Symmetry: C3
Subunit: 205 residues, 3 copies
């Protein structure tokens, strides 16, 4: 099966199985392992790997999409001695996660979000982009091949294609999404299409 529990390890005494909303579509050629929650109307495409086997949940909110070849994984959040590694945990609305992906988020083809990380609602994570040890705000756009490592990206900003942002001073001066910006409506269009694709693929299973 391609939806599987994580294994018993010294960091993980009890296996967990994914919790997947019945309206989500998981492609048979995707892999989803371990302590993962997938929300309503989410589409998970071929060759995506969502793997939560080092402690703490990976959460994917409602109406989000995880496109072909995307990887979600996280650094260990509990060491062998049972002690939580706080640097590797993100907090969102009072709850702790290894990776938090909000609602209406698009993780486009071949991107990767590696914990600890949080991605706020209505954000587009572009093709081949990379997010690690970062909090990306709501209504952001990471253009293709951009990256955010070790930073907080404020709400409503974009990272131009190819730019690798590693310092908070850079992140603070990113440009704002405006109506005339080329990707200002991209996420809404991609979310709308993927919610409908998920329903269509569900009707073929």
């Amino acid at each position: 099966s391609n939806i599987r529990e994580n294994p018993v390890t010294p960091n993980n005494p009890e296996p967990s199985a994914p919790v997947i909303d019945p309206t989500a579509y998981i492609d048979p050629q995707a892999s989803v392992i371990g302590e993962v929650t997938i929300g309503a109307n989410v589409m998970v495409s071929p060759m995506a790997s969502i793997r939560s086997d080092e402690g703490m949940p990976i959460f994917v909110g409602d109406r989000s999409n995880v496109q072909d070849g995307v990887v979600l994984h996280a650094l260990e959040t509990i060491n062998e001695e049972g002690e939580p590694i706080e640097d590797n945990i993100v907090e969102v609305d009072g709850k702790e996660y290894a990776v938090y992906i909000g609602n209406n988020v698009s993780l486009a083809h071949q991107s990767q979000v590696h914990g600890p990380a949080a991605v706020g609602d209505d954000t587009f994570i572009g093709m081949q982009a990379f997010v690690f040890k970062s909090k990306v705000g709501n209504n952001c756009v990471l253009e293709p091949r951009s990256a955010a490592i070790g930073v907080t990206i404020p709400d409503g900003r974009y990272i131009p294609a190819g730019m690798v942002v590693t310092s908070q001073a850079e992140a603070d001066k990113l440009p704002e999404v405006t109506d005339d910006y080329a990707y200002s409506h991209t996420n809404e269009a991609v979310v709308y299409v993927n919610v409908h694709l998920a329903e269509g693929y569900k009707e073929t299973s």
Copy 2:
């Protein structure tokens, strides 16, 4: 099955199944979905995802290769009201495509060509490279980790490794492939080898 029709959606009233030349080899661990035409002697490697589920064909010409982890997909080409979205369609020799990959093209490991896009004959798209909203001419080389977004790359030019080209003014001044250039013969060698690999893999199926 890993060769599948696309689903019924408001953008797609009729499912299409891939049209695959009998001399092509599709690895069992690749995925090919929807309105896709694959030409003669094409090799499609493990973990590639070719997904045409938003309207309009993805075409892969003869003696081309789609290597491991490559993704081909396209933006919607027909909106819900049945109206063709012309910005998201490319025209090649009088016919419309979402993605057109010409003959003798190598899409090397982990690259991605996302529609609307066209790639001309005898072009090497290097490892981890990215092409989106662009027309790449014939006899071009995209070195590893290069990208072309929103531009036309003239025939016979190369993009140096890691360079992300987003403006026509940059694309117009790219260097020319010459006989002494390090990748001048790379594509021909890779095509020759892959045509023979496709035949060898076909003999094991």
Copy 3:
């Protein structure tokens, strides 16, 4: 089966099957083809593709890990006339390889090491990184999205995130890993965790 022989080709008269230590874990959704040797306690994750079908071995040393979406492949090492192509072969401790990955090496998610290439022991190859026609020394760190093409990286150096190193003069001046460097202990932690994950996954098969 996902562990397979390579095909007969003019460059390869005799098919080879992978040699895999009994303590290694190969995920059912990984692909391993051809002349590959995998050492003890190695973990190969979903969607990785290790493909040795153009001559010469791909070797992965003990306690190394090949994470999700990683690709290992190599340029042809024997031409049709049976003549070895020496430029495409690396030598390590008196033996020839297409790709050599040493012991305790982490190939992190979505990275790629393409032959000819060698990666020395205790080196971290970061997420989405790329190594081609290069020798990476021991105790190195390639940060996420870095690349080494056509160079030798001296022992104990790191490449900052996003940097693409293509000239020996650049490689010679890379910074040194020190105890205070942010990734100085990353590989040891990742190796330790993955050796335990491999054992846990083996207990579920």
